[PDB]
């Protein structure tokens, strides 16, 4: 399993350009193309990003490419972050997947705020952290995503995502 698939599940994948209620142009896995207006403008960007002249629809491989771009950017920022870097750095690949997922959902700052939970994580206190975290507003608001992710932090496996 992989992070793209995790996110596919948690966030969702759109293969056709979408405009939300607040005027944003998005595609793939939350890939922001453009805020206001120009569908054509949005399509223009798209076309350039994947290196192809779409009709507004892309393939999964194409989404995966934009996503990977987005994942890097996020990891960059994670690194330039002082509350986040040592955790990331100390986590295993799977668990970071989870870390990234959270960032994708709530931003670095948002994540950066789970001081205690982060601490356990860095000191490898998995059940601790897991329990800590389930007592959160985040969990109450997006419980299904919260739970998988948490469970992921717990086991360090991808099982939460294979058993749906």
Swiss-Prot record:
Its EC number is 3.2.1.17. Optimum pH is 7.3. The active site is at 11 (proton donor/acceptor), 20 (proton donor/acceptor). It holds the Pfam family Phage_lysozyme. GO terms for cellular component: host cell cytoplasm. Endolysin with lysozyme activity that degrades host peptidoglycans and participates with the holin and spanin proteins in the sequential events which lead to the programmed host cell lysis releasing the mature viral particles. Once the holin has permeabilized the host cell membrane, the endolysin can reach the periplasm and break down the peptidoglycan layer. This is Endolysin. The lineage of its organism: Viruses, Duplodnaviria, Heunggongvirae, Uroviricota, Caudoviricetes.
């Amino acid at each position: 399993m992989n992070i793209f698939e995790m996110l596919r599940i948690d966030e969702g994948l759109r293969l056709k350009i979408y405009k939300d209620t607040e005027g944003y142009y998005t595609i793939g896995i939350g890939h922001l193309l453009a805020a206001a207006a120009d569908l054509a403008a949005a399509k223009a960007a798209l076309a350039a990003a994947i290196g192809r002249n779409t009709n507004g629809v892309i393939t999964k491989d194409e989404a995966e490419k934009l996503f990977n771009q987005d994942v890097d950017a996020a990891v960059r920022g994670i690194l330039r972050n002082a509350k986040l870097k040592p955790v990331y750095d100390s986590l295993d690949a799977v668990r970071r997947a989870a870390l990234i997922n959270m960032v994708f959902q709530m931003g670095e700052t948002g994540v950066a705020g789970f001081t205690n939970s982060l601490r356990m994580l860095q000191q490898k206190r998995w059940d601790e952290a897991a329990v800590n975290l389930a007592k959160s507003r985040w969990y109450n608001q997006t419980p299904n995503r919260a739970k998988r992710v948490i469970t992921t932090f717990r086991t360090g496996t991808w099982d939460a995502y294979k058993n749906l």
